[PDB]
Amino acid sequence: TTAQAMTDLVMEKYDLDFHASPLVHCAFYGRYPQTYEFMGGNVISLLAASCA
Amino acid sequence: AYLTEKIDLYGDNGKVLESDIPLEAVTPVQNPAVRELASIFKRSVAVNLGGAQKALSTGHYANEYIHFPDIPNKDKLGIKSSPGGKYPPKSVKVRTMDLPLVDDADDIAARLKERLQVNPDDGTEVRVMKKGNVLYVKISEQLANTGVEYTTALTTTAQAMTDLVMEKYDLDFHASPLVHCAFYGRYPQTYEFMGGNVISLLAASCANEGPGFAMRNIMANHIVAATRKRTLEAVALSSTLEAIGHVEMGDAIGRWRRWQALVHACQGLNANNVVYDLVKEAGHGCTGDVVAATVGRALEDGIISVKKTLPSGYKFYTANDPSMWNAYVCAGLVAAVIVNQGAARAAQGVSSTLLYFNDLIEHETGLPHAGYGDGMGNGVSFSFFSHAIYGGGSPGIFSGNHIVTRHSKGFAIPVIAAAVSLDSGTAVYGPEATSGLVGDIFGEVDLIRRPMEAIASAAAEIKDKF
Amino acid sequence: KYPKQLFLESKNSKMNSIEMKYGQDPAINRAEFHVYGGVRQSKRKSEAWEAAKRITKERGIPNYNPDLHLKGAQMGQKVLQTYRITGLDREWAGGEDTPAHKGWKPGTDIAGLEMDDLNYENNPAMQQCYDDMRRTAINGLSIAHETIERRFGKEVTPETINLYFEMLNHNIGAGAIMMEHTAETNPELVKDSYAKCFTGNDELADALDQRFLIDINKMFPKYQADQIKAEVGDRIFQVARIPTMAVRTSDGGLSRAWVGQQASLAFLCAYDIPAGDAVTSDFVFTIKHGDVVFMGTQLPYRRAQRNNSAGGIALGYYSDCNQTSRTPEALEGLDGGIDPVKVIVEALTPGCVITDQGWLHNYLAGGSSGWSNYIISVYTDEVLEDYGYHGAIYAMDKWKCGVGEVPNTYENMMTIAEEVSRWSQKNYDEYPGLMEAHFGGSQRYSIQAAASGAAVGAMTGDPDLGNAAWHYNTPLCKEHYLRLGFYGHDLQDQQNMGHTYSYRSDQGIPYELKGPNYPDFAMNVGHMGGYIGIIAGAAHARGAAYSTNPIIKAAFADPNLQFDFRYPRREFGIGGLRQFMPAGERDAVIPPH
Amino acid sequence: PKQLFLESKNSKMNSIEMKYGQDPAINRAEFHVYGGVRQSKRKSEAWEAAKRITKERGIPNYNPDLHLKGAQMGQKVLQTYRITGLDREWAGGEDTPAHKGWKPGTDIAGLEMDDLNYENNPAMQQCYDDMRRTAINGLSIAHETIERRFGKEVTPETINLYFEMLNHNIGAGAIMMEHTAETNPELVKDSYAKCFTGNDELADALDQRFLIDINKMFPKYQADQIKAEVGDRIFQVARIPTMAVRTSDGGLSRAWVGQQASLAFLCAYDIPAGDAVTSDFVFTIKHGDVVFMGTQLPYRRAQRNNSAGGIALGYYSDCNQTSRTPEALEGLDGGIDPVKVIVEALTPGCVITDQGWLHNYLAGGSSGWSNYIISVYTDEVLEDYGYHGAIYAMDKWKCGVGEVPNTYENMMTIAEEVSRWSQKNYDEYPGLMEAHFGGSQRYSIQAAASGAAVGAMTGDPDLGNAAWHYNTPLCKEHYLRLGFYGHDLQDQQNMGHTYSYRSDQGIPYELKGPNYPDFAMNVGHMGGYIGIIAGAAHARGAAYSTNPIIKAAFADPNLQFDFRYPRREFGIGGLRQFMPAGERDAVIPPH
Amino acid sequence: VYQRQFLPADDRVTKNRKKVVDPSVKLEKIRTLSDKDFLTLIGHRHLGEAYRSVNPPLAEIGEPEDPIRELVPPTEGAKAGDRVCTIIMTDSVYNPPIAHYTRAWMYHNRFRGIDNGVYSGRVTLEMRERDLEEACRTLFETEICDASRDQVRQYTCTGHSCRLDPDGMMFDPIERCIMSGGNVVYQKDSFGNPVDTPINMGKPLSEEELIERTVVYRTDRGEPMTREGDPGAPDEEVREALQWSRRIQWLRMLGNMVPDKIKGM
Ligand SMILES: C[C@@H](OP(=O)(O)O)[C@H](NC(=O)CCCCCCS)C(=O)O
Ligand SMILES: C[C@H](O)CO[C@@H](C)CO[C@@H](C)CO
Ligand SMILES: O=S(=O)(O)CCS
Ligand SMILES: O=S(=O)(O)CCS
Ligand SMILES: [Cl-]
């Protein structure tokens, strides 16, 4: 929820264009969903990914 | 902010259950019955005492035709087991044992409950079913909430069964691996309790496609078996599981939250009687009659309007409420499957209806179909992978976690549940084949079997909070 | 204002790739059927039938038998076409001997290949391309050197690094250094396994033994070397390739583990570290986890894989392992200007073959066909080539600019896609012989989508917008022909009309970092390689040396690789000629055969 | 009667003395007098080849003079090895796909360590490839769907056509479609499909080229046992191309057979292209009625089905086919010989789990850890110790194999004696102590021999493996050393875990495997357990230990590797006389 | 009830599409097939043969109480428990009177209780056996079946994109059709099996007649979907099918970015 909320609120707050959607998503989620992990993203849990 | 818009919740007989319900009150983050549904899936398991007893007795442990052989007639085999035949062959019995688990089910249930219970009156339940062959187990919220995982009912039940059987029959050291195998199967060589005798409605916790997918990894056949083929209750169960899953995926947030909540309400809970009304109008016809009914209902309710008339006379429609338009397409999509697969009483065309209801909608209106591509996309993938050599299977084996059918944001699996409910037995991998025990045991839970009225009643209890 | 189609006249050799299939004008809608002798028209299938008879007699079980084909109709009731590799007559560089073959004479065509010559199962160049990707392990060495200097107490110098690399080249394939009475591997079996390094520090590079160096200054043109060196900086990266034979006994996930063992040993032996000193565990951890670049990431349970499977390789990593971006053809092939189209059409060739034949087929499905004709269509006969260049010509004239410079607006994407779709359809409609050559709707649909995305990506520099143009081809194709591709082709096309610029959880992701585990892409042929090419060309067109990972780009700039990553269409053709010697064969230790 | 490692039973070779040309009882050797690696034919040839490779590719490679501090390898004797027991074989002389018939009873001696390195030995690689390229399925559901959903009768004639079509398409060909690419038959001549059934009338009605014939392959009592489990059912055994798994993984096998079997059903039964019934075929093959060699593994060591790490110990036991050989049926003076079964089944069990899996998946490098594992199937050492325990127990309990009561006390007695005998011989023969120079070899060997004796003599596989772990104090308190640093993780803990039922502790040995957490890391163990499981079942009169479908599925003379005689096969690979499948000669330049 | 418009129909090609898919428009019968020949061509059952069943008659299977199911009357094949059978047809790229996606749209508008797949080279229709027979009368006997360009073929279906043979006939690898005395005749059934007597389909249409009735756009005859002056031109200057295509793309893109972005668009 935090990753999606951050992505949505940033897209909204700065009224970003369509090009920004993948890039802002990447800023929070990293390589997800090509990776199961939010790999290299910017939302961090003390727990590991739930595949592990 | 709260989703304050008011909807009416109708039952599958087309009569109102509760009126004037804020959309907020059916969402998984608020509705107590939806939340209890997740909780019951997390906390319930079944113990197959008959299966465990049989495995121990015959040596047919686990799955895959495994058999640990005990040979009671060694002196009749035509072999010598001593050099020169000095000593005649003697049989041994080293992999198998006879324990009267089914006959002792009532006492076993009491011992199991005592091991699982944390405090008196905590809600732990163990029920003997099938004349002793199966136990239904529901662990307490106290136990289930101790850590962070949903697997605690599975893991504690397997260990408690193993311990209590070892103790009750005062078994020797040799029995430890065998009794463990009777309940756990191939665990821990497998992550799953593979071929064991402790069963959850949820899949093993290694098996998600992504974070938050656990409530999506439930086959349509399980849903249909648990609701005993009552079409809209199967739709409601599937849609509600998908709605919970999409919260857990993080997709019921922010500027997508209303869209996601309306998929659940309109497709899954017969909001404003749309699904029932569309089937009633078009049921004597074809998929295309549901297309006509859906566009007509969207116009009647002010969801869409004519935008432009082209020189040929063709009219583009505009969505006055895009998320509600999407939700009406989702309601029409389940109605279309009910009409088309219902006429045939055969599930297989569900994949074609998923594709072409959406394709016809776009050609009819100039508006985007359900999920902006996902409805048609999954119509394509699901059709392919239910009629080709490459993978897949029949409709009932798909789920929201299956790679073929995961993509749509909550509005695809419920139409599979509808189609499989309506099928007259045209499959070889139908609910009876894949999900018989699930339906017989977990289908006794009223909330699982008949969620619509429970969700509506719970929404009415909280309606004044929004 | 459009030139004669490349599929009717190759630019330099003037071959008519479509006419050559039939000996008849491809504009004529007339053909005779049932007059070719079935499979007797095919050299490979006829030879296969004779071989099959010998095999049946030796093993006692029948095998290939063309007369089993349904209802008495052998395959080959129509022409079983041959193929010409696109573009080989327009190459002028890359004539060096390689580990797999003597130098190709640049500009030489490869025509008349049969379908079975371009089947992944039959083509060792294609298999070796994948093996070279997956046997690669890449690491920064900074932490290992830090551990040695501080925990152990020994200085790291160019001399100690050179000894380390000499020892790693002894032990990565063949030998032992520290222990008595230790088994070793026959060097003949592992002659393709070695280790090198690269650095952005030119003084360090010059101080190292050049046999162990990937030389960025030599491999790349100056502007690209500058960009890559700026990213690498004053750091040393190791690139190790484990034996091809070894990954063929297991998986690409072996690579980081194997190099973890052998690099750890080379550190112990070059620095005289006691056997069992605690520092040892820092080396293996660094190689496996602490400072590591993988070609591929792990996959979830249904398609479970460790690192370095094809399904874990991001599209942009496929883009950047390709080396066409540093070739003269890509740097000066448009009348002295950069040619991002050449980059696109080369990078999409391993992109398509590895993701569709190597991965979707040889991991997820399979069988005897390799789905080969589906994918052969994207790198043969100049068809996709003509359509992609068509869009570039159209756009350069319309917007009066160079590659990478058309404004990246949604309207401009749609205009270019509409024209490229139009041109694709005009040619399939006007040339019945071409429509019959690309007989599967998927080939024709993917080709118009790929050409559109190639044009948009090359002309705007924007990889997401280039790939958006792919999906917009869905209605443009469907509403013209009233057919698309195979039953399951348009899952991803339909949904990515919406997902490309979505940010929902498992929908949004930049094209560079998508891959075969992006759920939309996880099942179907005919797509991923196109996206890979478009990503590579978009970066090339805007002046970049790579699209996604400069470490990957540098790590594949290596003439000791078995496969020539600069010229993959050519390499696949050489494999089609049975002229590509792969690594990993076991000749040294098996009987005469 | 002399120990087998000093005098092989029939050829009278002295396996230990042959390494040295000196009495192995003498505690004296000269060192630094062998010329380093020059004493080795393989390492000397390797150095010459390496010089050419360096010249050709421009990067140095193998160079023995890099060995630390100026000491080349070979400051002591680099010993050669003799395959155990080959002089005691009398059957199995048939030509195989990999080599002309072995003459049973012929020794293989003088092998160098490098000849028994997994990296250099195609017999070992092919053993694993044959396991992982196998797909096994029941066909009952596919036939049911054809009869009920599609509406066509299944007969022996339609089954024969189905198998003829599957043998055309599994490797090479197409059937239904125009203009379809195909694979060169030469590249896939090792790929084929067969079936078996417990219904003798059905078996006799099929084209026998497509049949795994249980009655022919097994002795009567074993055939009876297997047929009773199979019953009136048909099982398919399909082997996909070796070349194909070498481009990918063993998880390809069920997917590949899913495609090709589905096509053979469509084509043998004339089913329309795109009929809904098609999806039942692939689902049955991949999920609905399937037996795998290996189950999936969790994320840290992630694998699909049919990796070595997913293969249960008892599936390794049952793929071995020594249980149906004359040597195993009559080798103890006319009685069954479970020791022969143990020592053969543990050979692939150790080589595949340790070299094929722990080394070639989880770790790796140029050595194959080869000398560690060579020690368990050479020079008759483990052989002598295992037979010693069996003879001791038969004499003490006055019974045959499989008949000593399976008490904890009896396990400990046998283990104490076999440990004692192992230590006696290592202590009394300095040449043997030097041959098995690593403590791990000596420790695993006494534990393996003990477990072999207990398993063979009691028929109890968990108790046999309990005896393995009890060797830990018996070894440690005698020598005051055990094995390599990390050897005794599993031995220490399985002194307790064997008869635990805690969550990830309890599990029968048959269904343990390389993902049981105690076993997931370390060499020198799993293959021993595999042999013990096989021999325990053999000794009590059973035809298999764990899965009758697996046992029958590997009773197949068209397999590339001879699963009946694995020690012999590995030796044949050591002679460079094993032709593997999967090579690409047909489509590469002359060489 | 709302009156459907189906799809934009601004020219002959798209008006032909609308006629095919609009269930209120009768498709003209252009040939007669005997019951024996009709069933022989389908190849699932011959005249006088009893229907096979996949399940017992619907009234015997114990359907649950289910108010929604009540609203949907079963077809006759569903009541009987017939097996679900497949028929496959292929339309040439060369000016057919129906093509592949129009089949799906037509089937879903005209026939009850269907499964159906669209492919480039064939289209499946899968229905309870007796229901399939009724549908096939429309598929085989009406103006949507030109004998030379719309053919029945259960497998080995290549030909849609192949060059026409010297008689203007679409290729069939199995040769189930042959041109005989100017007539198209099935000399084998849809499965490629022998037939006792060939099934006469009558004369094919000429190319100009096919073009008048075709649903496909084709550049070579001067009727591409996208004309040379259409890319990037304003909507009012392009075909309505392209106007529609552009709209769907814009609305899928914007709506899947944020749904509210398409409000009023
Ligand atoms: C669908 C799924 O297979 P299952 O339905 O799980 O058997 C999946 N295979 C695939 O995606 C096959 C992809 C390649 C074949 C289609 C090429 S268009 C997989 O192996 O997990
Ligand atoms: C669906 C609608 O026709 C799309 O309109 C675009 C052509 C222009 O709209 C953009 C520029 C602003 O929303
Ligand atoms: O006919 S299908 O489209 O399902 C498969 C094409 S390879
Ligand atoms: O020295 S260690 O025991 O760590 C490794 C032995 S191979
Ligand atoms: Cl994460």
Ligand SMILES: [Cl-]
């Ligand atoms: Cl489980």
Ligand SMILES: [Cl-]
């Ligand atoms: Cl909204």
Ligand SMILES: [Cl-]
């Ligand atoms: Cl009749």
Ligand SMILES: [K+]
């Ligand atoms: K160099």
Ligand SMILES: [K+]
């Ligand atoms: K046979």
Ligand SMILES: [K+]
């Ligand atoms: K005891």
Ligand SMILES: [Mn+2]
């Ligand atoms: Mn060779």
